[model samples]
Target chain A: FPNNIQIGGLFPNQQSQEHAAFRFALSQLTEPPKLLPQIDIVNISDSFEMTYRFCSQFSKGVYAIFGFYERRTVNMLTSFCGALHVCFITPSFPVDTSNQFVLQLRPELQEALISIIDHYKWQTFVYIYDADRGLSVLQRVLDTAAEKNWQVTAVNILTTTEEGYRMLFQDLEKKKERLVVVDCESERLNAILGQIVKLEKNGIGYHYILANLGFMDIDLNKFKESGANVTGFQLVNYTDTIPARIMQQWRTSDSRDKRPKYTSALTYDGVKVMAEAFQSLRRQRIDISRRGNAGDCLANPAVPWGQGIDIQRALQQVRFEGLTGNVQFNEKGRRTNYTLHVIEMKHDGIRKIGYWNEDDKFVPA
Target chain B: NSIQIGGLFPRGADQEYSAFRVGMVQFSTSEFRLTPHIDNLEVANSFAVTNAFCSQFSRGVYAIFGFYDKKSVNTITSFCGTLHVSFITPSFPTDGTHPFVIQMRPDLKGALLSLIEYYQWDKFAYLYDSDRGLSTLQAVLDSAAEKKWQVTAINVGNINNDKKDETYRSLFQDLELKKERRVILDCERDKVNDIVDQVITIGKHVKGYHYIIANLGFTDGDLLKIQFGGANVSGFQIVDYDDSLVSKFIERWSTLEEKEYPGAHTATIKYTSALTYDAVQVMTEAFRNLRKQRIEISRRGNAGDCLANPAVPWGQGVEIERALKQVQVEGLSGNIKFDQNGKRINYTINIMELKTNGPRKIGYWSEVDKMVVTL
Candidate 1:
């Protein structure tokens, strides 16, 4: 592998929705088509493979990295990336403690969700989450409700049997509980909605506020018939010129699928962020070259290019309207400051209910 | 002026046990001194339950007043029957005839059915726990078809699933999804608290919702937390708080400065406590009746020796039981009377619903087939 300005793409598996986008972005990085630097991609099957391939990429002068493979792999990747002074971007990052050398595209939505709850004046509501780790997603709202002496019922819906799930829904009806927040995996949300429909709770009276950022990815067409107020946040702004152009490009080039997954949008955003940084470096006349011949990361300590810090600073300062609108970050390198398109599943399709931000809260757009 | 009674109570039954102790002490006069042989054990320890009952029996106690849960009710009943020593309990009624054990509390399924009928809820969720047993609502399940009712009986107890949080949550969620507004919550006191806390947390404890807590202690301090939750909380109470005797008992209850009584806003006691007190009252009256009849009472030996033989029994045990069944009196628990099976019957229980003010007696159910304003 020759030394080149490369964005290392690390995906957990080949079948990942972001992997195809990663490959496409790499193909576009060539001088004739791609404006951004070339990206060396790796589909890791295990932790050991990740360490091996990730180390190999560094010897090829990989500048930045993207993709959140597995949750456990995050700590290992962040540690090495931070040590090597590499700029790593991920869309899967939650709103918690910020990780070093990583820039998140999705802001923590709990505070925004709580603001939405207050906006609606929902004094009492039910909160349902998926797994043990997802508990914190509801904890902020729960603690707030407790402080305000608001009645907040919370339940974890990740039971082995669907019978348990059905029972909780039934009890909510018994209690006449209407408002509910679902903080489950984005993958499970559609099935839960489907279950809700089957249980006959799919009426005009029910209101659901989804906490997952990827809520837009779930097929919410079933909710359209039910006329329930299904609300959630979407990071992608389709109306933005850059996003519109890229989406058009993606649809035309990718004949296999017409529509793209939410991860694809984030992946595109990551690449665009690097392209802008590389542009700034070129403008400043900063020397961008390989520090040494490719050295095995496993056998030797990482001797990254001295320009890695400068590139990181440039990327941090580089904010633009890419595939996902207003890709920006705060001082801690966490994307805490961003706008989310608050959307609702309407009788037609998804309607832009409002826009949610830390300051403005839920602004009806 | 002497009478001995044994009491078997599981751990964490402090309120009821305290009330029983006080009842026995208060009733003790120059005419009679009630000596109690009380035993408390963990309800989970079935062997401990059996051991405690056998200990009480071995002590040559004339009669016994105790609590029997699902695990040891059969053991206690069989022991009492075999020994021909009368056993009085505040526990819910068991099926068939034990002939020796007398149930102090009335069968509450009838009252539950009456409330459901009064509310005219054709479809409702019946949430229960294993502690109360399935027989708690067997009558309703049987009659549900004729009434055209959709009675969804769900056991909200620990379902042996690793996902306790999920199951607990889904128990309520399923009910909400099904749109079954009316609910019958039959569980232990702690379970009731947990379920309500969860319901309120979900913000489902709102107006237009009706929860009929099947536990008699719905007015207990725990349930009182949800009085302002803006939902209709209704249940049945055997202990009529309005009664003068109950007021006096509560006054003494306050004097003790003991544990908080479960009733809303007052030192009003739980149904078990009331039943325990009344059980003592019933046994006293029966002993007095035996005295009045001049029926000679005999004790062969201690309860343990009696159990050891398994064949031998007390001479006057049958006579004392007969007197208990026949005797009737008005106590804290209204009209404590027993039928042929020695199970309390013809007792009036006031139907109560939680209002913004407190729990008020909405109506009363008596030996009569109809609901009335007061006894």
Candidate 2:
């Protein structure tokens, strides 16, 4: 920890205990929390497609975890590096891991993802699934995250297709802080939950947020009662934000002009982090050997903790805030969350087509 | 030899660069026509060069010249029986002392050399850019080596003038050992360090680095624009993006977006564009003059007299090369001319810095003795 403290370039360690601790607290902080402990999605069509896919899209799901902290400014900044706050998860078809798709058709997705990485300094995220298709997709995500020094956990979605719902039942066997990240068009409700109880859930990826409905009727109370975190609201759609619009306009101007957008909020947060670290350092007259560029923040005592140091807190939580609105958490220490309807077409059997709406559902956390 | 071919000034929004551009038209045109046989000779049009790598450009230039001369003499003799004319002063750089010159900034030279190293210009996809200052610097590279400057490369400030400016701006990253080179910053000071920080976190590869505010960058622009904010950059350099030429460019714009330049092209004027334009005119003038002389001689029944009367103009020969090698004409770069070996000297360069406040001017056009050695 002390070695890492040397990361904040200019911040020194010559200060009063309180100030020094504050400096150590921020600059010497470790990497952001890993998403591994919360969610895993991999494989498909083995023993459980429905339940695995569902849980994979919940709170800890690729979509939820990715989408959760996507403030515009932060999102804008990351888009250049292929950062996205949202990505689709499905069975890896061809080979490898289980995550299927995580990118939205929008540049906003990249922005959102990048923002999360920057704000949290996240180290890695692991998604587990069962099917080959899921594996293929998971592999792609793994490649992306790995390139960013982040982890991707791809698990087999279906262990065995012995019984129709065998894998589903197996997953529900444990009461882990699990979640399901699904497309807006998916809704197996009882079948996907595999046990009629919601694990921590997330409807991953972009859709007309708050619109698509089929998933609204999902019994959050039952899922929560059964030890699950449920989102009773719609997720943020970069498509619905300015960052996405600006990106679209920018890329269209010239293919060669492809560039990342920086939302005012994200820009603000950068300042917040910078000022906090610098001020904290100056107060203690403790300069971390590294100052500007790459080796910053590591030794900055003002750097803060994982979720504690991320965009939400940077934009919403800190008393002295920046970037987006001062992102304050509810007493629950959580912000607004959502889920959309599973838009599907019914022929002989009901199947998904595309997302349908945004006011899909609103429920109290 | 006294022919003034271009205007003078920085070619883009940032006034920091004025020595590399503005004078290219004449230089490029002469190089093309005088050496017509050379392939892509007109590449001086926008050819990327880091102060024209001596070991590289010289060999290429010489080889092209050799080929062109051989081809021209052979083709003319076979087609028209004889190609003879007054060869008295067709070439340039006739005298040892120069009567003309094109000045350049040293900072730009360093930047370009760095670029050559980065892209390994050996790849050849390099796209060169410069302010009027850089063009002048380039015009003089041939001579600078003669002076043993130990030249590196020359890069202009603000290649990408506006939005994509950062991308292009990053091309040089940090030149002159600029102070703010390591930290995150924005073009505007009032925007606050928070925004700069946000930009740093979101945009840069800042995983393992450090920072300290130094007297480097377009810091003056900040102080001028933001009052207390700009004062933070009281003595830092700030380039002028607005002037007679840049304004002219904006006037041609159909909308705000159009005026908002993505990079350095905005700095370019019709100079190079016009040189090509003027070179065409000069050739036509010489041809017509020769033709008229032929008609008159035919009337007088003296064929020999007609051919010698009109005379062939020099674009790259004894007089032209000599003129280029020694003309002090005020063209693209304000104070223009060449040194003994055809390099321009005495061009002004501005240096600035960014502070906790804003951008400010640190120094300008400082020559060898007055400037601090950054390296």
Candidate 3:
């Protein structure tokens, strides 16, 4: 076995907590004999920078690439990774099931979200979504809407201005849409929730289903006593021993975040998954070395890693209880057998009332 | 005296820009010449659009034109509303009333609905592209319930930038399984061609299928390629080349050197290009009326920075906007007029059907008379 293995990380920003968590996770893998790979991270501001940074990482012969959940660059990255036969493990939403090289850690929340809504027995509801990342989730909801014969009022939040938020909330109030499904980024979610509170709409006769996996990261203390029904999905089980230990370590670190984000935990879990995959390959006496002409993207009849398929197979076989519960993958490299805690806002705080898995679907906690 | 105007066009919008220049030159008299300040940018880039608008605002422009992107249209509309700078656009009309924004393109919802009704199409498929925005689709869907129409709506726009041929083939296969023949294709002009090409490639059920291209630029693409297929193809046309005024304008347009004017060589004009030409006429007419009324229209203080929210609402902008709304003139795109909200009104859209020769107008749809079939 090689003494050192190397992986690559592509982050949107330099100060990403996910990047820090990746490093933290690698540092914690110091349990002797279990060697971990050192990661080379490249920060990109936009999709234009992604090309050069990804090519640089590809030339470095990194075993896998991680980070970046942007919908804008997901397709390009997936195409590049597939062509080069490099394992691209991401916390981003899975684009398709057919991509050979992509291993998405972010559990597909569409089915779970739909189940929760159906559980509520809502025949009609308003769907407020951010125009950027919420369209895919909205598309699924709309597809399901046709199946269920549900009346859906889809609204796109195109602007971030305070007036825009206020206008949206006021319109929803006027329409008397008590049940709302919000699919947006955390910052936008916070703004929307704040507007709801400000408009005095966060009370009885109002319910919100937040269609985001990282719902636990948002502070719901304000709505704890509001008598409003706020439902969401939690990928990370904070009560778990592994997560608790990781949180303690993360807290002691110089990271600015008070609590671990869903992305950070997933990043940490992704690193562990790769390490285990490498370890498993090493046990089987399978040679894991980067071999390909990835230096030039325009190289005629571009060369892909010969051992990539082997590493990909090994990665698929990896199963563990990481920071995100029941980290596993299916044949399509999609996250499967994962558990999502169905959480709700209560008088005390946000509480997990149930859990959702593929087999049992939804079980009361 | 010279009046300053601004234009924000997407990169590679040479046709529209050339048309704008032609309009400026054609409308200019001894009294006042329109000084053009144009900026080309990526339509989807909101920051770039904002900076460009601010730069034009700094140039003391009376009115700004162009911007077809659904993504950044809202940004420009909001900016225009704030500054009271009139915005003339050839883009599809968005829902909700946007102040100081004059939409040149006639609303397609009424015409589309009328045409569907004219065909007596109780059941049809709506193949739309979401990248063009959901206003048109939403209109059809909203009317479907009341009209008791059975519509199977599908988004053909690829979000992942996948293989177009495969996507269309799969779409057609699914449609064929459902036995959907009558269809309304509402997509980008280029995408319309792609869909038509796919249909031709598929070659099955082409004789029986009926397609209504839901766009004003019906003749903009090579729809003649499918004329001999024996399929019933129909569309709306805003620019009636048969009109004397339009023919005269075409006569002048055809003579322009292709080197100077990018799309001048073609006998046919895209509806947006025609609308761009007409937009200049509308602005000029508005200015003429303002001058006739002696409503002293002058440039406002330069808007320094967009980020700093340096917007000084022009005192005379409201008057000029009112004049624009009231002015009635016959141009290339038929009678150009606007209602109180600055939406195109009293405009005519010719309903054309593809025959053995080419696209020939069978009927016309208007806001007042609705659909009137002459043939």
Q: Which stretches of candidate 2 lie over 4 Å from their true place?
A: A1-365, B1-199, B202-316, B331-333, B355-359, B372-375
Put down candidate 2 lDDT per residue, B1-375, tens digits, no spaces.
112121111123222111122212224443232223112221111111111111122222211111011112211111111111111111111112222221121124332333223223221111222211122233233233223222223222223335553543443343223322232122222233323333343343233322222212332222332332322221222123334533543344222232332323443332222222222233323333334444221112222211121332222233333433333433222344335544445544344444444334444443344443241
TM-score of 2: 0.21
Compare candidates 1 and 3 on DockQ and give the better one: 3
lDDT of 1 by residue, B1-375 (tens): 687777778777767766766777877678866778777776444345544655666677878777766545655665566678788877878755778778887877777777788888887777777565555555665456335466666655645546555666766766676676778889867778877877877778888789888866667637666789789998878777778988988777777744443232347677777888887788778888787788988565454443342246767788888888988788887887788897777877788888888888878886666766551
RMSD of each: 20.7, 29.5, 10.5
For candidate 1, write residues A1-365 as lDDT tens digits.
Answer: 12245566666556656767766775565432133233444433233345545666676667677767443244445555655677778777453433456787657777778777888868666777665346346445544653354555555565425775666566666555488888766567777777777874566467888886766677877777767788888877666787778777777888755456666777767776776777667767777666666654432244555777877788789887667667777777877557888877777877887888767768887
What lDDT score goes with residue B168 in model 1? Answer: 65
Give the Å shift of residue A292 in candidate 2: 66
State the C-alpha lDDT per candidate: 0.68, 0.26, 0.75
Fraction of the reference Cα-Cα interface contacts (below 8 Å) that each candidate reproduces: 0.00, 0.00, 0.00
Please list all clashing residue pairs in model 3, or write none if there are none.
none
Q: For model 3, state the Cα shift of residue B185 in Å.
A: 1.1
> Which one wins by lDDT: 1 or 3?
3
Better of 1 and 2 by lDDT: 1
Ranking by lDDT: 3, 1, 2
